Design a protein around this ligand. Structure first.
Ligand SMILES: [Zn+2]
Ligand SMILES: [Zn+2]
Ligand SMILES: [Zn+2]
Lengths: 133, 11, 132
């Protein structure tokens, strides 16, 4: 059984900067099992304070083993995937486990308007999850 | 990367 | 503020449990709020096939929620804690809510008398609960 699904997360007014190092924003829950995304706009910790950290969390309790490959990307103004980062294998998700990237994208890259990744100051993240069971 | 270690509980 | 308490549960004739996957035994209730333990001798589900699953259940609560950390261990023949598993952080309990570990210990480990954890065919579990 293969189940692939996605979620698009729009974070408005991203430049507002009301989340300090270690602080988190969580997305609404989604499914194809319930999942959510968690982002640290100023990094998970001191070694990552210069990056957005981004994680996929399994919220619900599965009945059988869940392994998932995941890919996170940023959508530009044309809706195209850019700066994608993909898990190098399927990871085991149990209830309450997250997996992701502590250094998903540089804050100083994302925040510079010229790179075009915050159109109307909106950060749009796209998460694709391929579940095998 | 994961933000947790140890054994997450289920329920 | 912390309120920490415990319960010891001895299950006799453990090797004779007829519970199939998904079936459950619950303990008597205890308190320092009423709680009990629940075990699935043959696992909760497919993910936990061939494990004993172990849970803390909040049976009765006068308010909406309780936050608690918990630790389960198996007491060996000397009464010592072994094969412990702990929540690490506090979990949110409401009346009727359980939290625990579906893969608490392999059934085939527990059931082999040679590991010494079923003296006289008795399983002794020890739960420590910290309401924080
Ligand atoms: Zn895609
Ligand atoms: Zn569960
Ligand atoms: Zn102890």
């Amino acid at each position: 059984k293969v189940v692939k699904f996605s979620y698009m997360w729009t974070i408005n007014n991203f430049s507002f900067c009301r989340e300090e190092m270690g602080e988190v924003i969580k997305s609404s829950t989604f499914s194809s099992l319930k999942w959510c995304l968690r982002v640290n706009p100023k990094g998970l910790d001191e070694e990552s304070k210069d990056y957005l950290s981004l994680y996929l969390l399994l919220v619900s309790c599965p009945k059988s083993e869940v392994r998932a490959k995941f890919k996170f990307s940023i959508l530009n103004a044309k809706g195209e995937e850019t700066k994608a980062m993909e898990s190098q294998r399927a990871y085991r998700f149990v209830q309450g486990k997250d997996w992701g990237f502590k250094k998903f994208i540089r804050r100083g890259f994302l925040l510079d308007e010229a790179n075009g990744l915050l159109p109307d100051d909106k950060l749009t993240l796209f998460c694709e999850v391929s579940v095998v069971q | 990367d994961s933000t947790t270690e140890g054994t997450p509980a289920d329920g």
